[PDB]
Structure 1
Amino acid sequence: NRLKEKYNKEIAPALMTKFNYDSVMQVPKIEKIVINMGVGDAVQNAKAIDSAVEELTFIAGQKPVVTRAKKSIAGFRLREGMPIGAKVTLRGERMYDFLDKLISVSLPRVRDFRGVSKKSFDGRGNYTLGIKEQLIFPEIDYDKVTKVRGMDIVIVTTANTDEEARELLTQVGMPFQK
């Protein structure tokens, strides 16, 4: 838990003095995070495999909630209210501790320590991540038979310019194109 403690300790005065804000309430600190599996057989035609749901459970704090389709996607045929992938939201200390367990192991669990530079944002403060990889935590090594387990984890902040996202993900330390 101590992560967000020391994060306050450092960032509040640091980001206040480097960016002169009139009020402290203006400091952009992270609030919420969501990961989107968005697979559901990835084609919805396997129609029977949902290992995604339980791996999402025990890699996260809670269990996900399965999404569904709404319209008729041309790239597919059986898409009418059927379920495709799930999602997980979290903002409390589960958020922070998952962030820590991420930056601790999955950042070494990469094949390259360069991550991605700040080229995949939405200007006013956010960060998508690219997940076509397979192994996040060794919690799933042989139980998983290396089937495609990608994700879409999106962290978002109360910022207004991309530079804030940059500085925020740097001050805690994320692999970029340094």
Structure 2
Amino acid sequence: AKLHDYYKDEVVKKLMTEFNYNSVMQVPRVEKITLNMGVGEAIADKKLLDNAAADLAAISGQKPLITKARKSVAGFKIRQGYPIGCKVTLRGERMWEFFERLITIAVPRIRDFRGLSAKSFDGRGNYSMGVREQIIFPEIDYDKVDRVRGLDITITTTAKSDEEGRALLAAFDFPFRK
């Protein structure tokens, strides 16, 4: 709803004219954002994953994709095709929607956070980070969830450098209020 527009006009031209590019397609556009929870819910309990699923589906408007283990591990017993966690890939609408909610409300509510963190880059231009306590989102509370989990995030973007990604991040609005 909100961030979508602030991205098109203000953010995009700011990055353009820091790398002095002449094409507006050489500007990073966010591509997707992944919501993995895989804290082993389905290794000792099939329905705890069903739960976990529903909880990602409350913040995203629709059911998630159930993830699965890709080979045999001896030290955790599991096998290829075995459920073990759940993702929700977000492109478009739901990306925006989430992105907003997140930075705006959630990012203040991160433990002892008060500035900027833009040092975690893949090599291409892509950003990730974790979530220890899931209740930091505006619609997830402890007086709503049955027991608390974390989860983690993978922000993909058409950047070709970490100069690029690193700037993108700082050009967004962290307001320090609820």
Task: Report TM bin, short chain.
Answer: 0.7 to 0.9
Letter in 1 for 2:20: N
Corresponding residue number in structure 2 for 1:139:
140
Whole-Å separation in 2 of the counterparts to 1:174 and 1:121? 20
Look up the SS of the partner of 1:48 in the other structure.
helix
TM-score normalized by the length of structure 1: 0.85
Q: Secondary structure at the match of 1:18?
A: coil
Instruction: Tell me how far apart the structure 2 counterparts of residues 132 and 79 of structure 1 sit (CA, whole Å).
Output: 27
Distance in 2, matches of 1:78 and 1:94, equals: 32
Aligned-pair CA distance for 1:21: 1.2
Partner-residue secondary structure (3-state), 1:35: strand
For 2:141, the aligned partner's letter is I
Alpha carbons 2:118, 2:169 under 8 Å: kept: no
State the partner residue of 2:103: 103
Deviation at 1:109, TM superposition (A): 2.0
Aligned to 1:67: 67
When residues 66 and 58 of structure 1 are mapped into structure 2, their CA distance, relative to the original with a 3 A threshold, is: same
Question: Match for 2:145: what amino acid?
Answer: K
Displacement of 1:26 = 1.2
Q: Distance in 2 between matches of 1:136 and 1:85?
A: 20
CA contact (8 A) 1:33 1:156 kept: yes
Pairing 1:48–2:42 present: no
Tell me the distance in 2 between the aligned counterparts of 1:100 and 1:66.
Answer: 25
* Structure 2 counterpart of 1:152: 152
Q: Deviations over 1:106-144 (max 9, x none)?
A: 112212124763332212211111222231335332232
- Alignment length, in residue pairs? 173
Contact 1:109 1:135 in 2 (8 A): no
Match of 1:7 in 2: 7
Kept after mapping to 1: 8 A contact 2:67/2:84: yes
In structure 1, the gaps of 5 or more residues are: none
Shift of the 154–99 alpha-carbon distance from structure 1 to 2, 3 Å rule, reads same
RMSD of aligned C-alpha atoms? Answer: 2.2
Tell me the distance in 1 between the aligned counterparts of 2:122 and 2:82: 30
Unaligned runs of 5+ in 2: none
- Name the CA shift for 1:161/1:111 in 2 (closer, same or farther; >3 Å): same
Compared with structure 1, are the counterparts of its residues 39 and 15 closer, same or farther at alpha carbon in structure 2 (3 Å cutoff)?
A: same
**Which letter maps to 1:37?**
M
Query: Who is 1:121 aligned against?
Result: 121
